Design a protein around this ligand. Structure first.
Ligand SMILES: [Ca+2]
Ligand SMILES: [Ca+2]
Ligand SMILES: [Ca+2]
Ligand SMILES: [Ca+2]
Ligand SMILES: [Ca+2]
Ligand SMILES: [Ca+2]
Ligand SMILES: [Ca+2]
Ligand SMILES: [Ca+2]
Ligand SMILES: [Ca+2]
Ligand SMILES: [Cl-]
Ligand SMILES: [Cl-]
Ligand code: NA
Ligand code: NA
Lengths: 381, 371, 371, 371
């Protein structure tokens, strides 16, 4: 097969599908891009066996073909060029058992050895039974809010992923670990098909880098156990996590009369400083709230360091003494971008509910629950 | 004052009370009070006061403030020898033809304790109290708990004594139906004096008297006195967090479970140190993994399990620490759902009126918390 | 001691000297910053036992003192602030208190008396050099130093000063850089070998200014002084290799070529190169450079034709692409010459443009040799 | 690669070389090289390289970089059982995994890139000496405590090795203590003198057995290569001139104290508690057959005065020594009695064991006096 394509267009297409190639040589055929050339359309596929990324670009050609091109090398090769048309010709090695990909650029020649394309598996016929639509910019903000930066909990399978709930009234995006619950809600995302599914983290991270922040629609189609995203000339296919996500709404305390209103960056930077003085193993801080004063306390009995900070705030509520793991709390505060947050509390053994004060669009809301540190004897019952 | 005492006896007395000396400078001293051949030795950090006394040979009485680290270092540097001490303000030590001097503080500056006016009292055998502390004093606890949960709850009434401790991962309830006192009392002991008391208490039938006033406990045991400031507040209602129905019973060799978790946890993330249990049939599957570094462990442990399949996760350090305190060959762990505590109890070795209950809180995503 | 200073000023000073605290110091006292306060001047010292970094900043205070502050933690603490005045109070198990309005922080301190003092430096010789010239010397030489602790002299940079010029040489036996400045003239003639690690640290602290750096010498130490910084380093003992014997007197085969063009061409060609030697072949004839790379293990190949100016006989010579690209990326000229003799002799790269009047650079690459 | 080995042998092999891995990231790995049922294990900190080898069962060859702390922790968690190790490609990343199979249990340890682990350097031996393992080990037992722990004056941080055709000398000093260990039964044609650094010697002391098995030491410019059974140790030698240690040792020392070692040691330990906190000095006042020990701390008002009967033939002398250095030196000796030979109150005292030395073995431990 032979085709001519602008190197910039080729690089962008290759870069889009490359995030799923892990460098693993356990299935060596999956270290390749799969090129499929048909009627001036170059379809490029990469996969790790569970996530598959596909894109296509127009090219100039007169013939068809299929090629398995080693991905890391070939992308490095394309990256080494400026913007110029490149010619690609598959040649059978004059001495060998397989075939070469030759690149022609003026008087210069390059050869990249190819794998056996017949060994690159075909994807199965996707038989969509349901589909939803969501704008790319909305989906990417959902991923900004639900994908945690740290995740060192060994959770059960349904909670290791992100829940997507779509119905005719709204969409919900939910994630959790032992310290946090994020519920992100869009009442402006409405679909006839009611569907619920759990997306694993790795394809979500891969998709997050590919998604643009635009009003362009993403189609998501579903079969037995896969989701198929379609966005411009891209297709992303992911294995879903089987099972039923817990009834997360039942965990949200109904009454939270103790409302802290505070500048977000002040609370975030204060906790970060205080936790430097706590025990390196647990990184906990205590909140003592009373009047319009937040008293932060951290100490490390092993090393004799201590922090005591008084932070002015708006607090209408009863005196409360409540402890938190600072790393998980500050990560959530870093995800919000508002000037002010509220943290609504009830008892020291119940989660605090963090919400932005400002900065939400009309039909957008987010709820961030932070589970406090509580001795087991004082658990809710 | 002047007295003669064998260095070994003096050393044991000093070591008994030295554990509380860490504070303001007068509290860095031992307080010596000599009265009719009885040398009372007092040490304090301002909240806990430890007292012991030993017989000595003397002809007069007195009071001295002796700097503790220095003096115990000195006594330790001797072999077993009768030593003469003369207060002169210096303390002179005489050993045959050898002379030593230690500078002294002003004893008049050492705070006296107020006269203790007991309103209630309980008694408990030292061995019973000592076992209670073995079961409730955690080897490590790094949680910043609220003040009432940083201590150990003592409950005495006419029917039983209860000893309860907790952190974010554990609840220990130690019950003795053979410890009965007329006085009903409930109080929270801070951990630090409890640790010192655990090392001094013997495993004997000698009785420990505990007396109380407004907010102090005074323990008496042989020639020791321990006076501790109690933690103010009410301990939480711990019985309400113990699940009532636990149809899923694991019976398993404790040492095998303990060593298996220890190995598997080497393969977990160093930050959280968690293992997942997959129970089905008579087989426990242990799984640990470190997603950051691609390490993994999968182990199969034979057991007796009659119950439904369960997939439940635990923090290994806190689980293994409680299992290490128990001494029976087998334990039962009773579970219900993956978001509820598992109840660990020994199979053998409890006396007639002794029971131990250990709750392990599992690792559970907040979305699936109990409700 | 007690002093007040803006957090931003303290952070920059700490950051200046922190690069020599490498973490796991075999002596734990060397994990501290040493603070010495004298007449409103806070002198801050860090050391790994061989290199000592010193800076000082003005502060507001009423007394003097000495403190050893744990470095990693204290820098973390200062970094966690914005630009605000901070109050520091030494409380001598010695503590450091930090006061900010109504907020209080305590950092446990080590014993400053345990921090080693530096010996009185007894300078016998000294040279001066502009900071910008010295840093340019380091930019050109540090990448070529060896990383084997086998030949210590090659892990450093040779410094040569006399009344006519300053010369800087580095090598790892595969590359040689000679950097020469005839506008750096000092009465004292001195020759010495500086270790790479303090040189890298110094390179980041040095600014690109005409302000002078003083270097003073005693038996086997160099003391650099530059503004309010002092850097004291142990010199490498021994004789630097006879590097001029590696430069052939004649290199008649001269390639003249655009630097970025040669650099980007080698970069592309190297993707196809031998994973073991990462070799690119230059085939020169007429006014055409042919670049060839191939990977015998994986069946990839590159053949590139670059028009150039070449005066010499036909030559086919191989070089390590990693070393060649590193060297071409350090130079900044539009054009370079590469002078060669035989296929088993070095290629010598020099910039054509962009050098100051009394500045010259020589970058030698050993060829690839194989059967 | 795939191999089977007893867990106990693997643990012993790993612990032998693991002492050199401190906290470059590639050097935190063991390097495994498997060839014809021989598993060679390498560890290094970049300056010291330790190598051991053990027989294993295998059918293929290979190379692995195994993370050391984790892997040794893993091996330690097993008892004595055969373990199977299989290198597999990672399923989700670019690296490679080491699988450990124990019956139905599977464990995976992520591996580093072995191609990034440095090869051993070509050793070009020019000279060699031989010495029994036990003799060398005893030499290090006597000398390592005396080395300086200040990195100022590097050569004093090592132990001098002197071999010639007549004897071997091992010398250490920190300018306050000097130890000379002499063996007139260690003879080699090659006369060699070199300085070994302290850290590898401490490791080497523990690997060496107390047997007549020969240690071969080969040398080049600044590397020593020790070979002892299936171990290889490669260390960078310390360059520079060791002090002329023979000039501080007085030849004539007419004032000789002979005394039980434990009696002098325990007596100095006691006195040193009462001594000057800055110098920790004790005075010897020797006359007749009486040793008067005196210590005092004028700042804190403590004093010690001891009379010890002894054998002293000499003139009345009043001489002070550091009790900390004296007690350490007496604790390293193991004889029943020691002699301390003195001359003037401002000249060193020389301590030697009285009994227990072999015919051609001598020990000299010199203490610089306080003045
Ligand atoms: Ca066409
Ligand atoms: Ca509906
Ligand atoms: Ca928004
Ligand atoms: Ca009497
Ligand atoms: Ca019992
Ligand atoms: Ca001033
Ligand atoms: Ca700042
Ligand atoms: Ca000259
Ligand atoms: Ca073992
Ligand atoms: Cl979970
Ligand atoms: Cl709590
Ligand atoms: Na008195
Ligand atoms: Na000070």
């Amino acid at each position: 097969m032979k085709f001519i394509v602008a190197s910039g267009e080729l690089q962008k297409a290759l870069q889009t599908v490359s995030g799923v190639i892990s460098g693993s040589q356990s299935r060596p055929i999956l270290e390749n891009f799969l090129f499929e050339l048909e009627n001036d359309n170059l379809k490029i596929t990469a996969s790790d066996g569970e996530t598959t990324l596909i894109t296509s670009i127009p090219v100039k050609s007169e013939n068809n073909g299929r090629m398995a091109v080693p991905a890391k090398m070939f992308l490095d090769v394309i990256k080494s060029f400026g913007d110029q048309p490149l010619t690609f010709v598959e040649k059978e090695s004059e001495n060998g058992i397989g075939s070469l990909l030759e690149i022609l650029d003026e008087k210069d020649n390059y050869f990249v050895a190819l794998d056996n394309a017949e060994d690159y598996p075909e994807l199965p016929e996707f038989d969509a039974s349901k589909s939803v639509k969501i704008q790319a910019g909305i989906l990417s903000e959902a991923l900004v809010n639900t994908l945690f930066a740290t995740s060192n909990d060994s959770l059960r399978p349904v909670m290791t992923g992100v829940l997507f709930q779509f119905n005719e009234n709204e969409a919900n995006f939910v994630s959790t670990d032992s310290h946090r619950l994020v519920v992100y809600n869009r009442k402006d995302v409405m679909n006839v098909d009611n569907i619920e599914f759990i997306m694993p983290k790795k394809p979500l991270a891969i998709i997050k880098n590919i998604l643009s922040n635009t009003d362009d629609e993403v189609l998501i189609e579903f079969n037995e156990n896969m989701a198929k995203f379609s966005f411009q000339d891209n297709i992303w296919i992911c294995r879903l996590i089987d099972g039923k996500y817990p009834n997360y709404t039942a965990v949200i305390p109904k009454e939270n009369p103790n409302v802290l209103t505070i500048n977000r960056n002040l609370l975030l930077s204060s906790i970060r400083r205080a936790s430097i003085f706590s025990n390196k193993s647990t990184n906990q801080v205590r909140f003592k709230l009373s009047g319009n004063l937040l008293h932060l306390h951290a100490e490390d009995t092993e090393y004799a360091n201590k922090a005591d900070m008084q932070i002015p705030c708006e607090y209408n509520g009863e005196d409360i003494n409540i402890g938190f793991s600072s790393k998980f709390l500050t990560e959530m505060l870093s995800v919000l971008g508002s000037d002010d947050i509220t943290m609504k509390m009830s008892q020291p053994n119940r989660p605090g509910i963090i919400e932005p004060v400002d900065g939400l669009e009309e039909n957008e809301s987010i709820l961030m629950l932070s589970m406090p540190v509580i001795g087991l004897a004082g658990h809710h019952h």
